[PDB]
Scaffold this motif. Structure first.
Motif, PDB file in Angstrom:
ATOM      1  N   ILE A   1     -36.514 -39.548 -35.361  1.00  0.00           N
ATOM      2  CA  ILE A   1     -36.156 -38.207 -35.704  1.00  0.00           C
ATOM      3  C   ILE A   1     -35.695 -38.095 -37.138  1.00  0.00           C
ATOM      4  O   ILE A   1     -35.931 -37.100 -37.797  1.00  0.00           O
ATOM      5  CB  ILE A   1     -34.997 -37.734 -34.815  1.00  0.00           C
ATOM      6  CG1 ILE A   1     -35.453 -37.550 -33.386  1.00  0.00           C
ATOM      7  CG2 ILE A   1     -34.443 -36.412 -35.317  1.00  0.00           C
ATOM      8  CD1 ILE A   1     -34.274 -37.283 -32.472  1.00  0.00           C
TER       9      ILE A   1
ATOM     10  N   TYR B   1     -27.844 -43.889 -44.028  1.00  0.00           N
ATOM     11  CA  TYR B   1     -27.226 -44.546 -42.867  1.00  0.00           C
ATOM     12  C   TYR B   1     -28.150 -45.604 -42.288  1.00  0.00           C
ATOM     13  O   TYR B   1     -27.817 -46.779 -42.269  1.00  0.00           O
ATOM     14  CB  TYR B   1     -26.875 -43.524 -41.781  1.00  0.00           C
ATOM     15  CG  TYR B   1     -28.047 -42.668 -41.356  1.00  0.00           C
ATOM     16  CD1 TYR B   1     -28.508 -41.627 -42.171  1.00  0.00           C
ATOM     17  CD2 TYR B   1     -28.697 -42.895 -40.147  1.00  0.00           C
ATOM     18  CE1 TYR B   1     -29.584 -40.845 -41.792  1.00  0.00           C
ATOM     19  CE2 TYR B   1     -29.774 -42.112 -39.753  1.00  0.00           C
ATOM     20  CZ  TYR B   1     -30.212 -41.091 -40.580  1.00  0.00           C
ATOM     21  OH  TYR B   1     -31.280 -40.300 -40.210  1.00  0.00           O
TER      22      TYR B   1
ATOM     23  N   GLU C   1     -25.988 -38.346 -26.557  1.00  0.00           N
ATOM     24  CA  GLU C   1     -26.783 -37.249 -26.021  1.00  0.00           C
ATOM     25  C   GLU C   1     -27.816 -36.689 -27.013  1.00  0.00           C
ATOM     26  O   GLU C   1     -27.635 -36.721 -28.226  1.00  0.00           O
ATOM     27  CB  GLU C   1     -25.878 -36.133 -25.536  1.00  0.00           C
ATOM     28  CG  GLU C   1     -25.064 -35.437 -26.649  1.00  0.00           C
ATOM     29  CD  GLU C   1     -24.282 -34.182 -26.120  1.00  0.00           C
ATOM     30  OE1 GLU C   1     -24.907 -33.210 -25.647  1.00  0.00           O
ATOM     31  OE2 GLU C   1     -23.037 -34.160 -26.161  1.00  0.00           O
ATOM     32  N   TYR C   2     -28.924 -36.213 -26.474  1.00  0.00           N
ATOM     33  CA  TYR C   2     -29.969 -35.587 -27.241  1.00  0.00           C
ATOM     34  C   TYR C   2     -29.662 -34.087 -27.377  1.00  0.00           C
ATOM     35  O   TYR C   2     -29.467 -33.404 -26.387  1.00  0.00           O
ATOM     36  CB  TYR C   2     -31.308 -35.783 -26.528  1.00  0.00           C
ATOM     37  CG  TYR C   2     -32.502 -35.064 -27.165  1.00  0.00           C
ATOM     38  CD1 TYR C   2     -32.769 -35.182 -28.527  1.00  0.00           C
ATOM     39  CD2 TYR C   2     -33.384 -34.304 -26.394  1.00  0.00           C
ATOM     40  CE1 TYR C   2     -33.868 -34.594 -29.100  1.00  0.00           C
ATOM     41  CE2 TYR C   2     -34.501 -33.719 -26.963  1.00  0.00           C
ATOM     42  CZ  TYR C   2     -34.749 -33.881 -28.324  1.00  0.00           C
ATOM     43  OH  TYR C   2     -35.850 -33.262 -28.916  1.00  0.00           O
ATOM     44  N   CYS C   3     -29.625 -33.591 -28.607  1.00  0.00           N
ATOM     45  CA  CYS C   3     -29.422 -32.170 -28.863  1.00  0.00           C
ATOM     46  C   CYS C   3     -30.727 -31.547 -29.309  1.00  0.00           C
ATOM     47  O   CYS C   3     -31.045 -31.543 -30.510  1.00  0.00           O
ATOM     48  CB  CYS C   3     -28.384 -32.020 -29.946  1.00  0.00           C
ATOM     49  SG  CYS C   3     -26.860 -32.741 -29.444  1.00  0.00           S
TER      50      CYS C   3
ATOM     51  N   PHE D   1     -24.646 -29.251 -33.868  1.00  0.00           N
ATOM     52  CA  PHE D   1     -25.902 -29.468 -33.177  1.00  0.00           C
ATOM     53  C   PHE D   1     -26.003 -28.557 -31.961  1.00  0.00           C
ATOM     54  O   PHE D   1     -24.992 -28.100 -31.437  1.00  0.00           O
ATOM     55  CB  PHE D   1     -26.034 -30.952 -32.819  1.00  0.00           C
ATOM     56  CG  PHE D   1     -25.890 -31.856 -34.023  1.00  0.00           C
ATOM     57  CD1 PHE D   1     -24.634 -32.150 -34.529  1.00  0.00           C
ATOM     58  CD2 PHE D   1     -27.020 -32.336 -34.699  1.00  0.00           C
ATOM     59  CE1 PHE D   1     -24.496 -32.944 -35.663  1.00  0.00           C
ATOM     60  CE2 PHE D   1     -26.906 -33.147 -35.832  1.00  0.00           C
ATOM     61  CZ  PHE D   1     -25.644 -33.452 -36.319  1.00  0.00           C
TER      62      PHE D   1
ATOM     63  N   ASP E   1     -20.352 -36.247 -35.863  1.00  0.00           N
ATOM     64  CA  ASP E   1     -19.361 -37.195 -36.344  1.00  0.00           C
ATOM     65  C   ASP E   1     -19.232 -37.308 -37.861  1.00  0.00           C
ATOM     66  O   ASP E   1     -18.498 -38.183 -38.339  1.00  0.00           O
ATOM     67  CB  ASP E   1     -19.607 -38.584 -35.730  1.00  0.00           C
ATOM     68  CG  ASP E   1     -20.831 -39.308 -36.338  1.00  0.00           C
ATOM     69  OD1 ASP E   1     -21.338 -38.884 -37.407  1.00  0.00           O
ATOM     70  OD2 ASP E   1     -21.281 -40.321 -35.742  1.00  0.00           O
TER      71      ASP E   1
HETATM   72  C1  JUP Z   1     -28.122 -38.766 -38.747  1.00  0.00           C
HETATM   73  C2  JUP Z   1     -28.112 -37.694 -37.672  1.00  0.00           C
HETATM   74  O1  JUP Z   1     -26.902 -37.704 -36.949  1.00  0.00           O
HETATM   75  C3  JUP Z   1     -26.769 -36.939 -35.733  1.00  0.00           C
HETATM   76  C4  JUP Z   1     -27.918 -36.537 -35.003  1.00  0.00           C
HETATM   77  C5  JUP Z   1     -27.755 -35.758 -33.815  1.00  0.00           C
HETATM   78  C6  JUP Z   1     -28.895 -35.343 -33.091  1.00  0.00           C
HETATM   79  C7  JUP Z   1     -29.929 -34.689 -33.777  1.00  0.00           C
HETATM   80  C8  JUP Z   1     -31.068 -34.297 -33.040  1.00  0.00           C
HETATM   81  C9  JUP Z   1     -32.121 -33.630 -33.647  1.00  0.00           C
HETATM   82  C10 JUP Z   1     -33.211 -32.981 -33.081  1.00  0.00           C
HETATM   83  C11 JUP Z   1     -34.098 -32.409 -33.938  1.00  0.00           C
HETATM   84  C12 JUP Z   1     -35.350 -31.612 -33.474  1.00  0.00           C
HETATM   85  N1  JUP Z   1     -36.548 -32.443 -33.146  1.00  0.00           N
HETATM   86  C13 JUP Z   1     -36.914 -32.183 -31.774  1.00  0.00           C
HETATM   87  C14 JUP Z   1     -37.652 -32.014 -34.021  1.00  0.00           C
HETATM   88  C15 JUP Z   1     -33.832 -32.525 -35.313  1.00  0.00           C
HETATM   89  S1  JUP Z   1     -32.350 -33.387 -35.314  1.00  0.00           S
HETATM   90  C16 JUP Z   1     -31.113 -34.582 -31.637  1.00  0.00           C
HETATM   91  N2  JUP Z   1     -30.109 -35.213 -31.013  1.00  0.00           N
HETATM   92  C17 JUP Z   1     -29.000 -35.606 -31.696  1.00  0.00           C
HETATM   93  N3  JUP Z   1     -27.928 -36.280 -30.981  1.00  0.00           N
HETATM   94  C18 JUP Z   1     -26.468 -35.411 -33.370  1.00  0.00           C
HETATM   95  C19 JUP Z   1     -25.333 -35.834 -34.087  1.00  0.00           C
HETATM   96  C20 JUP Z   1     -25.484 -36.587 -35.267  1.00  0.00           C
HETATM   97  C21 JUP Z   1     -24.290 -37.017 -36.011  1.00  0.00           C
HETATM   98  N4  JUP Z   1     -24.448 -37.705 -37.278  1.00  0.00           N
HETATM   99  O2  JUP Z   1     -23.207 -36.790 -35.557  1.00  0.00           O
HETATM  100  C22 JUP Z   1     -28.591 -36.346 -38.181  1.00  0.00           C
HETATM  101  C23 JUP Z   1     -27.662 -35.437 -38.727  1.00  0.00           C
HETATM  102  C24 JUP Z   1     -28.075 -34.173 -39.201  1.00  0.00           C
HETATM  103  C25 JUP Z   1     -29.440 -33.835 -39.140  1.00  0.00           C
HETATM  104  C26 JUP Z   1     -30.395 -34.777 -38.611  1.00  0.00           C
HETATM  105  C27 JUP Z   1     -29.974 -36.021 -38.140  1.00  0.00           C
HETATM  106  C28 JUP Z   1     -31.017 -36.964 -37.544  1.00  0.00           C
HETATM  107  F1  JUP Z   1     -32.189 -36.403 -37.760  1.00  0.00           F
HETATM  108  F2  JUP Z   1     -31.012 -38.201 -38.088  1.00  0.00           F
HETATM  109  F3  JUP Z   1     -30.803 -37.129 -36.209  1.00  0.00           F
END
Ligand code: JUP
Length: 253
Positions: free
Chosen positions: A12, A17, A85-87, A139, A150
């Motif tokens: 994703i 990081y 968890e997946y958001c 998210f 976080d």
């Molecule tokens: C580094 C990363 O950190 C976190 C990620 C999540 C989190 C993000 C997502 C996403 C889904 C989508 C849509 N996709 C279906 C096209 C784009 S991003 C899904 N589940 C998740 N748990 C949640 C928390 C964090 C955190 N650092 O606390 C992050 C941070 C901001 C934007 C993107 C990301 C990525 F892409 F690396 F996950």
């Protein structure tokens, strides 16, 4: 509790990081994600610090806080996995950016959701005393829930509170103030090219009203969070007593 327990579907996000992947738990098929981190090049201290942080995530359980599940160690590749968890809805920054591109404002109902559930995120965090309020660290799941990540636990610091900007729970209200204003306006309340210019505008304390599609009631509350005096900002409690905020604006399982 071994990488072998999950299957990687795809990536994703990449860092920085390290890497974030959508994965599936083999035991039941639950869709999760995990953060990848290669610790191979870190000192012993940095690694004790990292272990220090991870123990924190394990402590917070709350419907509006991105949920920690597992931590996996792979000493073979010096890779650390944090499983969460997946958001499915992504981060708010992307939503705001999307809103900017196709020139479409968001529904007041959506702002009210974010306002409500994040205020409750704060209320939880202040109690355990942290995470920082900005679109990138917010998210959305598949159920109209809104969750704080976080981050915090080169660029212009758009959300800096007047008091910081200087030498407080009320500072967090300001930040939340800036985040909802940006959600409504599709732009921060104070913009500039340098931090110094920024600072000058924030000490003035003027900004546009959010678009007229948003109720006077919404505008008034966001406006109150952007009050120059910390003590004039509404607390988490006065925020929640607001007539705008209803049950269906809260989290749901
Ligand atoms: C580094 C990363 O950190 C976190 C990620 C999540 C989190 C993000 C997502 C996403 C889904 C989508 C849509 N996709 C279906 C096209 C784009 S991003 C899904 N589940 C998740 N748990 C949640 C928390 C964090 C955190 N650092 O606390 C992050 C941070 C901001 C934007 C993107 C990301 C990525 F892409 F690396 F996950």
């Amino acid at each position: 509790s071994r990488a072998e327990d999950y299957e990687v579907l795809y990536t994703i996000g990449t860092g920085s990081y390290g890497r974030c992947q959508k994965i599936r738990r083999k035991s039941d098929g639950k869709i999760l994600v995990w953060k990848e981190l290669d610790y191979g090049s870190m000192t012993e201290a940095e690694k004790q610090m990292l272990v220090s942080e991870v123990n924190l995530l394990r402590e917070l359980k709350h419907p509006n806080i991105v949920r920690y599940y597992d931590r996996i160690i792979d000493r073979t590749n010096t890779t650390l996995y944090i499983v969460m968890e997946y958001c499915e809805g992504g981060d708010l920054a992307s939503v705001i950016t999307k809103g900017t591109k196709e020139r479409q404002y968001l529904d007041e109902e959506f702002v009210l959701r974010v306002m409500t559930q994040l205020t409750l995120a704060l209320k939880e965090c202040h109690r355990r005393s942290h995470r920082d309020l900005k679109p990138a660290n917010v998210f959305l799941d598949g159920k109209q829930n809104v969750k704080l990540g976080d981050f915090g636990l080169v660029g212009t610091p758009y959300y800096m509170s007047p008091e910081q900007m200087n030498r407080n729970e009320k500072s967090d209200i300001w930040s939340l103030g800036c985040l909802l204003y940006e959600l409504c306006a599709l732009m921060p309340p104070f913009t500039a090219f340098s931090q110094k210019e920024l600072a000058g505008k924030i000490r003035e304390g003027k900004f546009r009203r959010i678009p007229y599609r948003y109720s006077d009631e919404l505008n008034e509350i966001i406006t109150r969070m952007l009050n120059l005096k910390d003590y004039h900002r509404p607390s988490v409690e006065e925020i929640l007593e607001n007539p705008l905020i209803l049950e269906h604006h809260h989290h749901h399982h």
